[PDB]
PDB file of N, CA, C and O in Angstrom:
ATOM      1  N   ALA A 401     -29.542  72.772 -58.612  1.00 22.02           N
ATOM      2  CA  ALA A 401     -28.887  71.828 -58.456  1.00 22.02           C
ATOM      3  C   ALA A 401     -27.469  72.090 -57.367  1.00 22.02           C
ATOM      4  O   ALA A 401     -26.414  71.978 -57.422  1.00 22.02           O
ATOM      5  N   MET A 402     -28.298  72.315 -56.045  1.00 20.98           N
ATOM      6  CA  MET A 402     -27.339  72.927 -54.936  1.00 20.98           C
ATOM      7  C   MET A 402     -27.566  71.916 -53.767  1.00 20.98           C
ATOM      8  O   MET A 402     -28.383  71.973 -53.030  1.00 20.98           O
ATOM      9  N   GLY A 403     -27.531  70.703 -53.855  1.00 21.32           N
ATOM     10  CA  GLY A 403     -27.860  69.582 -52.648  1.00 21.32           C
ATOM     11  C   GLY A 403     -26.734  68.755 -52.842  1.00 21.32           C
ATOM     12  O   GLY A 403     -26.522  67.560 -53.839  1.00 21.32           O
ATOM     13  N   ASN A 404     -26.034  69.104 -52.260  1.00 23.17           N
ATOM     14  CA  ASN A 404     -24.490  67.886 -51.778  1.00 23.17           C
ATOM     15  C   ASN A 404     -24.421  67.874 -50.349  1.00 23.17           C
ATOM     16  O   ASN A 404     -23.313  67.478 -49.369  1.00 23.17           O
ATOM     17  N   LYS A 405     -25.768  67.316 -49.520  1.00 24.51           N
ATOM     18  CA  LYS A 405     -25.732  66.785 -48.152  1.00 24.51           C
ATOM     19  C   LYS A 405     -24.877  65.328 -47.945  1.00 24.51           C
ATOM     20  O   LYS A 405     -24.823  64.088 -48.343  1.00 24.51           O
ATOM     21  N   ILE A 406     -24.658  65.299 -46.845  1.00 24.97           N
ATOM     22  CA  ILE A 406     -23.779  64.105 -46.339  1.00 24.97           C
ATOM     23  C   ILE A 406     -24.119  63.568 -45.204  1.00 24.97           C
ATOM     24  O   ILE A 406     -24.802  64.319 -44.588  1.00 24.97           O
ATOM     25  N   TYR A 407     -23.930  62.436 -45.178  1.00 25.52           N
ATOM     26  CA  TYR A 407     -24.400  61.293 -44.112  1.00 25.52           C
ATOM     27  C   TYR A 407     -23.276  60.955 -43.074  1.00 25.52           C
ATOM     28  O   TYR A 407     -22.418  59.846 -43.598  1.00 25.52           O
ATOM     29  N   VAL A 408     -22.984  60.711 -42.024  1.00 23.68           N
ATOM     30  CA  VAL A 408     -22.197  60.571 -41.338  1.00 23.68           C
ATOM     31  C   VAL A 408     -22.786  59.449 -40.109  1.00 23.68           C
ATOM     32  O   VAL A 408     -23.920  59.597 -39.363  1.00 23.68           O
ATOM     33  N   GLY A 409     -22.607  58.160 -40.518  1.00 21.45           N
ATOM     34  CA  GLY A 409     -23.264  57.301 -39.556  1.00 21.45           C
ATOM     35  C   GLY A 409     -21.921  56.785 -38.430  1.00 21.45           C
ATOM     36  O   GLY A 409     -21.501  55.361 -38.668  1.00 21.45           O
ATOM     37  N   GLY A 410     -21.988  57.588 -38.027  1.00 17.80           N
ATOM     38  CA  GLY A 410     -20.793  57.293 -36.854  1.00 17.80           C
ATOM     39  C   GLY A 410     -20.655  58.290 -35.873  1.00 17.80           C
ATOM     40  O   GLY A 410     -19.454  58.711 -35.228  1.00 17.80           O
ATOM     41  N   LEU A 411     -21.825  58.673 -34.954  1.00 20.69           N
ATOM     42  CA  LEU A 411     -22.142  59.526 -34.196  1.00 20.69           C
ATOM     43  C   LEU A 411     -21.903  58.962 -32.494  1.00 20.69           C
ATOM     44  O   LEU A 411     -22.644  57.989 -32.349  1.00 20.69           O
ATOM     45  N   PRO A 412     -20.816  59.399 -32.138  1.00 20.32           N
ATOM     46  CA  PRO A 412     -20.922  58.775 -30.135  1.00 20.32           C
ATOM     47  C   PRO A 412     -21.839  59.426 -29.450  1.00 20.32           C
ATOM     48  O   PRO A 412     -21.922  60.745 -29.796  1.00 20.32           O
ATOM     49  N   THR A 413     -22.179  58.811 -28.416  1.00 20.39           N
ATOM     50  CA  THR A 413     -23.499  59.545 -27.907  1.00 20.39           C
ATOM     51  C   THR A 413     -22.693  59.955 -26.444  1.00 20.39           C
ATOM     52  O   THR A 413     -23.483  60.701 -25.818  1.00 20.39           O
ATOM     53  N   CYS A 414     -21.052  59.899 -26.643  1.00 20.25           N
ATOM     54  CA  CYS A 414     -20.319  60.925 -25.612  1.00 20.25           C
ATOM     55  C   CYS A 414     -20.363  62.221 -26.004  1.00 20.25           C
ATOM     56  O   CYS A 414     -20.010  62.830 -24.630  1.00 20.25           O
ATOM     57  N   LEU A 415     -20.382  62.560 -27.039  1.00 20.69           N
ATOM     58  CA  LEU A 415     -20.553  63.937 -27.592  1.00 20.69           C
ATOM     59  C   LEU A 415     -21.895  64.404 -27.926  1.00 20.69           C
ATOM     60  O   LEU A 415     -22.589  63.896 -28.504  1.00 20.69           O
ATOM     61  N   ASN A 416     -21.600  65.764 -28.176  1.00 18.67           N
ATOM     62  CA  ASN A 416     -22.973  66.517 -28.900  1.00 18.67           C
ATOM     63  C   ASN A 416     -22.330  66.965 -29.932  1.00 18.67           C
ATOM     64  O   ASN A 416     -21.308  66.948 -30.604  1.00 18.67           O
ATOM     65  N   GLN A 417     -23.179  67.368 -31.100  1.00 20.42           N
ATOM     66  CA  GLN A 417     -23.331  67.331 -32.382  1.00 20.42           C
ATOM     67  C   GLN A 417     -21.961  68.408 -32.613  1.00 20.42           C
ATOM     68  O   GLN A 417     -21.137  68.746 -33.468  1.00 20.42           O
ATOM     69  N   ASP A 418     -21.955  69.657 -31.433  1.00 24.80           N
ATOM     70  CA  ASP A 418     -21.004  70.581 -31.720  1.00 24.80           C
ATOM     71  C   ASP A 418     -19.436  70.239 -31.921  1.00 24.80           C
ATOM     72  O   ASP A 418     -18.564  70.642 -32.431  1.00 24.80           O
ATOM     73  N   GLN A 419     -19.332  68.954 -31.032  1.00 22.23           N
ATOM     74  CA  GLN A 419     -17.833  68.153 -31.306  1.00 22.23           C
ATOM     75  C   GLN A 419     -17.439  68.041 -32.649  1.00 22.23           C
ATOM     76  O   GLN A 419     -16.792  67.627 -33.371  1.00 22.23           O
ATOM     77  N   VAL A 420     -18.814  67.192 -33.244  1.00 25.68           N
ATOM     78  CA  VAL A 420     -18.814  66.415 -34.531  1.00 25.68           C
ATOM     79  C   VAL A 420     -18.627  67.660 -35.507  1.00 25.68           C
ATOM     80  O   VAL A 420     -17.821  67.060 -36.664  1.00 25.68           O
ATOM     81  N   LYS A 421     -19.066  68.270 -35.341  1.00 25.79           N
ATOM     82  CA  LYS A 421     -19.296  69.777 -36.277  1.00 25.79           C
ATOM     83  C   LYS A 421     -18.336  70.434 -36.805  1.00 25.79           C
ATOM     84  O   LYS A 421     -17.492  70.409 -37.695  1.00 25.79           O
ATOM     85  N   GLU A 422     -17.731  70.352 -35.519  1.00 26.80           N
ATOM     86  CA  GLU A 422     -16.082  70.470 -35.766  1.00 26.80           C
ATOM     87  C   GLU A 422     -15.031  70.105 -36.302  1.00 26.80           C
ATOM     88  O   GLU A 422     -14.067  70.537 -36.773  1.00 26.80           O
ATOM     89  N   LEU A 423     -15.505  68.316 -36.226  1.00 28.37           N
ATOM     90  CA  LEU A 423     -14.321  67.399 -37.136  1.00 28.37           C
ATOM     91  C   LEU A 423     -15.055  67.614 -38.252  1.00 28.37           C
ATOM     92  O   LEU A 423     -13.859  67.625 -39.332  1.00 28.37           O
ATOM     93  N   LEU A 424     -16.110  67.884 -38.967  1.00 27.85           N
ATOM     94  CA  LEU A 424     -16.707  68.024 -40.210  1.00 27.85           C
ATOM     95  C   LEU A 424     -16.125  69.277 -40.960  1.00 27.85           C
ATOM     96  O   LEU A 424     -15.689  69.015 -41.734  1.00 27.85           O
ATOM     97  N   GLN A 425     -16.201  70.330 -40.023  1.00 29.10           N
ATOM     98  CA  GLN A 425     -15.662  71.421 -40.340  1.00 29.10           C
ATOM     99  C   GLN A 425     -14.136  71.471 -40.843  1.00 29.10           C
ATOM    100  O   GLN A 425     -13.783  72.667 -40.946  1.00 29.10           O
ATOM    101  N   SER A 426     -13.329  70.832 -40.345  1.00 30.42           N
ATOM    102  CA  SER A 426     -11.837  70.469 -40.553  1.00 30.42           C
ATOM    103  C   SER A 426     -11.342  70.565 -41.946  1.00 30.42           C
ATOM    104  O   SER A 426     -10.465  71.036 -42.332  1.00 30.42           O
ATOM    105  N   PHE A 427     -12.608  70.017 -43.071  1.00 32.25           N
ATOM    106  CA  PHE A 427     -12.333  69.640 -44.385  1.00 32.25           C
ATOM    107  C   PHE A 427     -13.261  71.075 -44.704  1.00 32.25           C
ATOM    108  O   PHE A 427     -12.686  71.458 -46.053  1.00 32.25           O
ATOM    109  N   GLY A 428     -14.032  71.644 -44.252  1.00 34.02           N
ATOM    110  CA  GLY A 428     -14.217  73.308 -44.830  1.00 34.02           C
ATOM    111  C   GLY A 428     -15.454  73.834 -43.843  1.00 34.02           C
ATOM    112  O   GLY A 428     -15.707  73.043 -42.986  1.00 34.02           O
ATOM    113  N   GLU A 429     -15.996  74.782 -44.219  1.00 34.75           N
ATOM    114  CA  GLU A 429     -17.001  75.193 -43.626  1.00 34.75           C
ATOM    115  C   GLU A 429     -18.045  74.856 -43.747  1.00 34.75           C
ATOM    116  O   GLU A 429     -18.882  74.376 -44.917  1.00 34.75           O
ATOM    117  N   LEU A 430     -18.933  74.637 -42.555  1.00 34.85           N
ATOM    118  CA  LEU A 430     -20.338  74.094 -42.612  1.00 34.85           C
ATOM    119  C   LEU A 430     -21.530  74.827 -42.767  1.00 34.85           C
ATOM    120  O   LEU A 430     -21.181  76.138 -42.065  1.00 34.85           O
ATOM    121  N   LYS A 431     -22.513  74.461 -43.580  1.00 35.90           N
ATOM    122  CA  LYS A 431     -23.347  75.116 -43.611  1.00 35.90           C
ATOM    123  C   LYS A 431     -24.584  75.103 -42.937  1.00 35.90           C
ATOM    124  O   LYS A 431     -25.590  75.438 -42.685  1.00 35.90           O
ATOM    125  N   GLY A 432     -24.793  73.640 -42.406  1.00 33.00           N
ATOM    126  CA  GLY A 432     -25.539  72.954 -41.643  1.00 33.00           C
ATOM    127  C   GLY A 432     -25.399  71.657 -41.328  1.00 33.00           C
ATOM    128  O   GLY A 432     -24.838  70.749 -41.825  1.00 33.00           O
ATOM    129  N   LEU A 433     -25.830  71.559 -40.066  1.00 34.90           N
ATOM    130  CA  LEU A 433     -25.618  70.065 -39.541  1.00 34.90           C
ATOM    131  C   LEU A 433     -27.340  69.539 -38.496  1.00 34.90           C
ATOM    132  O   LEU A 433     -27.669  70.296 -37.797  1.00 34.90           O
ATOM    133  N   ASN A 434     -27.242  68.468 -39.346  1.00 33.45           N
ATOM    134  CA  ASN A 434     -28.778  67.977 -38.456  1.00 33.45           C
ATOM    135  C   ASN A 434     -28.318  66.644 -37.858  1.00 33.45           C
ATOM    136  O   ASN A 434     -27.893  65.564 -38.532  1.00 33.45           O
ATOM    137  N   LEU A 435     -28.076  67.199 -36.657  1.00 35.54           N
ATOM    138  CA  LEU A 435     -27.800  65.871 -35.481  1.00 35.54           C
ATOM    139  C   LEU A 435     -29.003  65.077 -35.333  1.00 35.54           C
ATOM    140  O   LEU A 435     -29.972  65.696 -34.412  1.00 35.54           O
ATOM    141  N   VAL A 436     -28.956  64.132 -35.800  1.00 36.03           N
ATOM    142  CA  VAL A 436     -30.334  63.024 -35.369  1.00 36.03           C
ATOM    143  C   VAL A 436     -30.506  62.424 -33.948  1.00 36.03           C
ATOM    144  O   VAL A 436     -29.639  61.607 -33.466  1.00 36.03           O
ATOM    145  N   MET A 437     -31.327  63.014 -32.962  1.00 40.30           N
ATOM    146  CA  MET A 437     -31.073  62.830 -31.519  1.00 40.30           C
ATOM    147  C   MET A 437     -32.254  62.087 -31.282  1.00 40.30           C
ATOM    148  O   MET A 437     -33.529  62.478 -31.510  1.00 40.30           O
ATOM    149  N   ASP A 438     -32.384  61.369 -29.979  1.00 38.95           N
ATOM    150  CA  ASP A 438     -33.375  60.853 -29.120  1.00 38.95           C
ATOM    151  C   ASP A 438     -33.885  61.976 -28.377  1.00 38.95           C
ATOM    152  O   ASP A 438     -33.065  61.750 -26.918  1.00 38.95           O
ATOM    153  N   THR A 439     -34.792  62.097 -28.840  1.00 36.25           N
ATOM    154  CA  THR A 439     -35.408  63.346 -27.803  1.00 36.25           C
ATOM    155  C   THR A 439     -35.636  62.456 -25.871  1.00 36.25           C
ATOM    156  O   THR A 439     -36.017  63.717 -25.450  1.00 36.25           O
ATOM    157  N   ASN A 440     -35.860  61.403 -26.302  1.00 37.70           N
ATOM    158  CA  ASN A 440     -36.288  60.855 -25.054  1.00 37.70           C
ATOM    159  C   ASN A 440     -34.580  60.867 -23.936  1.00 37.70           C
ATOM    160  O   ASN A 440     -35.037  60.590 -22.810  1.00 37.70           O
ATOM    161  N   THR A 441     -33.874  60.249 -24.419  1.00 37.11           N
ATOM    162  CA  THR A 441     -32.534  60.250 -23.637  1.00 37.11           C
ATOM    163  C   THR A 441     -31.743  61.440 -24.030  1.00 37.11           C
ATOM    164  O   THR A 441     -30.876  62.039 -23.171  1.00 37.11           O
ATOM    165  N   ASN A 442     -32.253  62.278 -24.756  1.00 40.81           N
ATOM    166  CA  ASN A 442     -31.241  63.703 -25.150  1.00 40.81           C
ATOM    167  C   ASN A 442     -29.732  63.287 -25.938  1.00 40.81           C
ATOM    168  O   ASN A 442     -29.032  63.878 -25.592  1.00 40.81           O
ATOM    169  N   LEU A 443     -29.529  61.730 -26.413  1.00 43.85           N
ATOM    170  CA  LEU A 443     -28.509  61.088 -27.031  1.00 43.85           C
ATOM    171  C   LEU A 443     -28.873  61.526 -28.576  1.00 43.85           C
ATOM    172  O   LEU A 443     -29.742  61.500 -29.159  1.00 43.85           O
ATOM    173  N   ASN A 444     -27.696  61.268 -29.260  1.00 41.25           N
ATOM    174  CA  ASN A 444     -27.115  60.935 -30.455  1.00 41.25           C
ATOM    175  C   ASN A 444     -27.837  59.655 -31.228  1.00 41.25           C
ATOM    176  O   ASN A 444     -27.905  58.456 -30.496  1.00 41.25           O
ATOM    177  N   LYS A 445     -28.658  59.405 -31.969  1.00 42.05           N
ATOM    178  CA  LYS A 445     -28.792  58.140 -32.836  1.00 42.05           C
ATOM    179  C   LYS A 445     -28.023  57.777 -33.348  1.00 42.05           C
ATOM    180  O   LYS A 445     -27.847  56.158 -33.852  1.00 42.05           O
ATOM    181  N   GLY A 446     -26.744  57.959 -33.418  1.00 41.51           N
ATOM    182  CA  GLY A 446     -25.699  57.385 -33.973  1.00 41.51           C
ATOM    183  C   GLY A 446     -25.205  57.694 -35.461  1.00 41.51           C
ATOM    184  O   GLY A 446     -24.290  57.445 -36.003  1.00 41.51           O
ATOM    185  N   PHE A 447     -25.413  58.734 -36.177  1.00 46.26           N
ATOM    186  CA  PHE A 447     -25.839  59.197 -37.248  1.00 46.26           C
ATOM    187  C   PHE A 447     -26.399  61.134 -37.271  1.00 46.26           C
ATOM    188  O   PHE A 447     -27.343  61.240 -36.466  1.00 46.26           O
ATOM    189  N   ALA A 448     -25.653  61.558 -38.407  1.00 43.27           N
ATOM    190  CA  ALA A 448     -25.975  63.283 -38.728  1.00 43.27           C
ATOM    191  C   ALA A 448     -26.071  63.222 -39.961  1.00 43.27           C
ATOM    192  O   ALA A 448     -25.471  62.857 -40.911  1.00 43.27           O
ATOM    193  N   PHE A 449     -26.751  64.440 -40.541  1.00 42.31           N
ATOM    194  CA  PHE A 449     -26.796  64.612 -41.812  1.00 42.31           C
ATOM    195  C   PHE A 449     -25.892  66.307 -41.622  1.00 42.31           C
ATOM    196  O   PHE A 449     -26.514  67.048 -40.960  1.00 42.31           O
ATOM    197  N   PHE A 450     -24.888  66.615 -42.716  1.00 42.36           N
ATOM    198  CA  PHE A 450     -24.516  67.951 -43.247  1.00 42.36           C
ATOM    199  C   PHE A 450     -24.320  68.261 -44.154  1.00 42.36           C
ATOM    200  O   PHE A 450     -24.270  67.731 -45.262  1.00 42.36           O
ATOM    201  N   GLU A 451     -24.090  69.749 -44.560  1.00 38.07           N
ATOM    202  CA  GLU A 451     -23.352  69.908 -46.119  1.00 38.07           C
ATOM    203  C   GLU A 451     -22.814  71.176 -45.573  1.00 38.07           C
ATOM    204  O   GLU A 451     -22.810  72.142 -44.666  1.00 38.07           O
ATOM    205  N   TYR A 452     -21.685  71.297 -46.604  1.00 38.48           N
ATOM    206  CA  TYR A 452     -20.652  72.321 -46.457  1.00 38.48           C
ATOM    207  C   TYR A 452     -21.146  73.524 -46.943  1.00 38.48           C
ATOM    208  O   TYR A 452     -22.273  73.188 -47.763  1.00 38.48           O
ATOM    209  N   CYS A 453     -20.396  74.842 -46.753  1.00 38.21           N
ATOM    210  CA  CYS A 453     -20.739  75.841 -47.571  1.00 38.21           C
ATOM    211  C   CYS A 453     -20.554  76.160 -49.111  1.00 38.21           C
ATOM    212  O   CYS A 453     -21.454  76.398 -50.312  1.00 38.21           O
ATOM    213  N   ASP A 454     -19.519  74.899 -49.217  1.00 38.34           N
ATOM    214  CA  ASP A 454     -19.289  74.953 -50.601  1.00 38.34           C
ATOM    215  C   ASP A 454     -19.713  73.331 -51.220  1.00 38.34           C
ATOM    216  O   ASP A 454     -19.138  72.700 -50.473  1.00 38.34           O
ATOM    217  N   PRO A 455     -20.232  73.453 -52.071  1.00 41.18           N
ATOM    218  CA  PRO A 455     -20.569  72.080 -52.992  1.00 41.18           C
ATOM    219  C   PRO A 455     -19.621  70.895 -53.250  1.00 41.18           C
ATOM    220  O   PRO A 455     -19.798  70.051 -53.132  1.00 41.18           O
ATOM    221  N   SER A 456     -18.350  71.664 -53.642  1.00 45.04           N
ATOM    222  CA  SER A 456     -17.652  71.020 -54.063  1.00 45.04           C
ATOM    223  C   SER A 456     -16.959  70.268 -52.915  1.00 45.04           C
ATOM    224  O   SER A 456     -15.887  69.146 -53.021  1.00 45.04           O
ATOM    225  N   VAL A 457     -16.730  70.856 -51.758  1.00 46.42           N
ATOM    226  CA  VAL A 457     -15.993  70.059 -50.288  1.00 46.42           C
ATOM    227  C   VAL A 457     -16.477  68.970 -50.212  1.00 46.42           C
ATOM    228  O   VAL A 457     -15.981  68.121 -50.019  1.00 46.42           O
ATOM    229  N   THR A 458     -17.818  68.430 -50.667  1.00 46.97           N
ATOM    230  CA  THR A 458     -18.444  67.366 -49.987  1.00 46.97           C
ATOM    231  C   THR A 458     -17.947  66.405 -50.900  1.00 46.97           C
ATOM    232  O   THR A 458     -17.378  65.451 -49.763  1.00 46.97           O
ATOM    233  N   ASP A 459     -17.255  66.131 -52.282  1.00 47.71           N
ATOM    234  CA  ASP A 459     -16.656  65.106 -52.349  1.00 47.71           C
ATOM    235  C   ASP A 459     -15.597  64.922 -51.966  1.00 47.71           C
ATOM    236  O   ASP A 459     -14.992  63.831 -51.665  1.00 47.71           O
ATOM    237  N   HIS A 460     -14.799  66.275 -51.609  1.00 50.65           N
ATOM    238  CA  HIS A 460     -13.619  65.703 -51.163  1.00 50.65           C
ATOM    239  C   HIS A 460     -13.486  65.530 -49.422  1.00 50.65           C
ATOM    240  O   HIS A 460     -12.493  64.661 -48.945  1.00 50.65           O
ATOM    241  N   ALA A 461     -14.583  66.320 -48.971  1.00 49.62           N
ATOM    242  CA  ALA A 461     -14.901  66.097 -47.364  1.00 49.62           C
ATOM    243  C   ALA A 461     -14.695  64.151 -47.230  1.00 49.62           C
ATOM    244  O   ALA A 461     -14.308  63.811 -46.522  1.00 49.62           O
ATOM    245  N   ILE A 462     -16.056  63.697 -47.678  1.00 48.57           N
ATOM    246  CA  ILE A 462     -16.298  62.347 -47.679  1.00 48.57           C
ATOM    247  C   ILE A 462     -14.961  61.595 -47.777  1.00 48.57           C
ATOM    248  O   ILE A 462     -14.552  60.149 -47.303  1.00 48.57           O
ATOM    249  N   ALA A 463     -13.948  62.014 -48.824  1.00 47.36           N
ATOM    250  CA  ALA A 463     -12.982  60.879 -49.224  1.00 47.36           C
ATOM    251  C   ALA A 463     -12.211  60.485 -48.250  1.00 47.36           C
ATOM    252  O   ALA A 463     -11.326  59.918 -48.026  1.00 47.36           O
ATOM    253  N   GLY A 464     -12.009  61.700 -47.066  1.00 45.99           N
ATOM    254  CA  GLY A 464     -11.015  61.594 -46.098  1.00 45.99           C
ATOM    255  C   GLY A 464     -11.752  61.423 -44.823  1.00 45.99           C
ATOM    256  O   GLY A 464     -11.274  60.619 -44.133  1.00 45.99           O
ATOM    257  N   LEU A 465     -13.058  61.879 -44.875  1.00 44.09           N
ATOM    258  CA  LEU A 465     -13.775  61.925 -43.426  1.00 44.09           C
ATOM    259  C   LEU A 465     -14.642  60.552 -43.629  1.00 44.09           C
ATOM    260  O   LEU A 465     -14.503  60.190 -42.053  1.00 44.09           O
ATOM    261  N   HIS A 466     -14.643  59.826 -44.367  1.00 45.46           N
ATOM    262  CA  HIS A 466     -14.928  58.261 -43.809  1.00 45.46           C
ATOM    263  C   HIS A 466     -14.138  57.357 -43.598  1.00 45.46           C
ATOM    264  O   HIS A 466     -13.102  56.959 -43.898  1.00 45.46           O
ATOM    265  N   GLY A 467     -14.173  57.470 -42.078  1.00 43.81           N
ATOM    266  CA  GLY A 467     -13.181  57.007 -41.328  1.00 43.81           C
ATOM    267  C   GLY A 467     -12.068  57.454 -40.372  1.00 43.81           C
ATOM    268  O   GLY A 467     -11.231  57.093 -40.603  1.00 43.81           O
ATOM    269  N   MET A 468     -13.090  58.669 -40.415  1.00 42.28           N
ATOM    270  CA  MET A 468     -11.984  59.640 -39.344  1.00 42.28           C
ATOM    271  C   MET A 468     -12.479  60.091 -38.111  1.00 42.28           C
ATOM    272  O   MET A 468     -13.734  60.707 -38.078  1.00 42.28           O
ATOM    273  N   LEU A 469     -11.772  59.548 -36.949  1.00 44.86           N
ATOM    274  CA  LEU A 469     -12.661  60.171 -35.505  1.00 44.86           C
ATOM    275  C   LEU A 469     -11.632  59.586 -34.676  1.00 44.86           C
ATOM    276  O   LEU A 469     -10.853  58.380 -35.256  1.00 44.86           O
ATOM    277  N   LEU A 470     -11.238  60.082 -33.294  1.00 43.96           N
ATOM    278  CA  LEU A 470      -9.902  59.712 -32.712  1.00 43.96           C
ATOM    279  C   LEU A 470     -10.774  58.548 -31.760  1.00 43.96           C
ATOM    280  O   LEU A 470     -12.116  58.315 -31.466  1.00 43.96           O
ATOM    281  N   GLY A 471      -9.749  57.667 -31.110  1.00 48.06           N
ATOM    282  CA  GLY A 471     -10.173  56.455 -30.712  1.00 48.06           C
ATOM    283  C   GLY A 471     -10.485  55.328 -31.433  1.00 48.06           C
ATOM    284  O   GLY A 471     -10.282  55.147 -32.253  1.00 48.06           O
ATOM    285  N   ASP A 472     -11.533  54.493 -30.868  1.00 45.46           N
ATOM    286  CA  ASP A 472     -12.097  53.378 -31.723  1.00 45.46           C
ATOM    287  C   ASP A 472     -13.353  53.832 -32.383  1.00 45.46           C
ATOM    288  O   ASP A 472     -13.695  53.272 -33.609  1.00 45.46           O
ATOM    289  N   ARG A 473     -14.118  55.179 -32.429  1.00 43.63           N
ATOM    290  CA  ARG A 473     -15.089  55.375 -32.395  1.00 43.63           C
ATOM    291  C   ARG A 473     -14.789  56.488 -33.865  1.00 43.63           C
ATOM    292  O   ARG A 473     -13.401  56.367 -33.941  1.00 43.63           O
ATOM    293  N   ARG A 474     -15.350  56.051 -34.883  1.00 44.72           N
ATOM    294  CA  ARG A 474     -15.175  56.698 -36.557  1.00 44.72           C
ATOM    295  C   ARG A 474     -16.334  56.879 -36.786  1.00 44.72           C
ATOM    296  O   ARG A 474     -17.568  56.687 -36.533  1.00 44.72           O
ATOM    297  N   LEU A 475     -16.206  58.020 -37.996  1.00 43.83           N
ATOM    298  CA  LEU A 475     -17.099  58.208 -39.242  1.00 43.83           C
ATOM    299  C   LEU A 475     -17.686  58.079 -40.272  1.00 43.83           C
ATOM    300  O   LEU A 475     -16.477  57.584 -40.874  1.00 43.83           O
ATOM    301  N   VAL A 476     -18.798  56.996 -40.513  1.00 46.84           N
ATOM    302  CA  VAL A 476     -19.056  56.793 -41.281  1.00 46.84           C
ATOM    303  C   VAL A 476     -19.354  57.829 -42.568  1.00 46.84           C
ATOM    304  O   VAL A 476     -20.542  58.156 -42.504  1.00 46.84           O
ATOM    305  N   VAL A 477     -18.865  58.167 -43.537  1.00 49.27           N
ATOM    306  CA  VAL A 477     -19.115  59.586 -44.098  1.00 49.27           C
ATOM    307  C   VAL A 477     -19.490  58.819 -45.257  1.00 49.27           C
ATOM    308  O   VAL A 477     -18.653  58.112 -46.233  1.00 49.27           O
ATOM    309  N   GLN A 478     -20.955  59.686 -45.878  1.00 49.31           N
ATOM    310  CA  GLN A 478     -20.955  59.201 -47.484  1.00 49.31           C
ATOM    311  C   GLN A 478     -21.929  60.203 -48.040  1.00 49.31           C
ATOM    312  O   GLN A 478     -22.650  60.798 -46.948  1.00 49.31           O
ATOM    313  N   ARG A 479     -22.315  59.869 -48.892  1.00 52.11           N
ATOM    314  CA  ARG A 479     -23.589  60.669 -49.879  1.00 52.11           C
ATOM    315  C   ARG A 479     -24.799  60.625 -48.977  1.00 52.11           C
ATOM    316  O   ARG A 479     -25.400  59.371 -49.116  1.00 52.11           O
ATOM    317  N   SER A 480     -25.298  61.375 -48.293  1.00 50.81           N
ATOM    318  CA  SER A 480     -26.937  61.040 -47.583  1.00 50.81           C
ATOM    319  C   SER A 480     -27.679  60.869 -48.471  1.00 50.81           C
ATOM    320  O   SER A 480     -27.843  60.827 -49.753  1.00 50.81           O
ATOM    321  N   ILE A 481     -28.631  59.680 -48.090  1.00 57.39           N
ATOM    322  CA  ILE A 481     -29.550  58.934 -48.824  1.00 57.39           C
ATOM    323  C   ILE A 481     -30.737  60.069 -48.803  1.00 57.39           C
ATOM    324  O   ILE A 481     -31.498  59.929 -48.118  1.00 57.39           O
TER     325      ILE A 481
END
């Protein structure tokens, strides 16, 4: 039982996953980030899926990360579907 994948539905198309990953890593060590991108435009779909190195960070991360990002743009963070 090692599956604590997180969903962020607040990806700005103005930035790349490298930017968001760094924001996600603010809560803990990132183990993997899947930015769902539109291969036609090379832009983000507006959401991504990630997971920390530690499974316990997940619950702690969502708690603060849900609604955290500079400006009007924000991250909708929750357990991934």
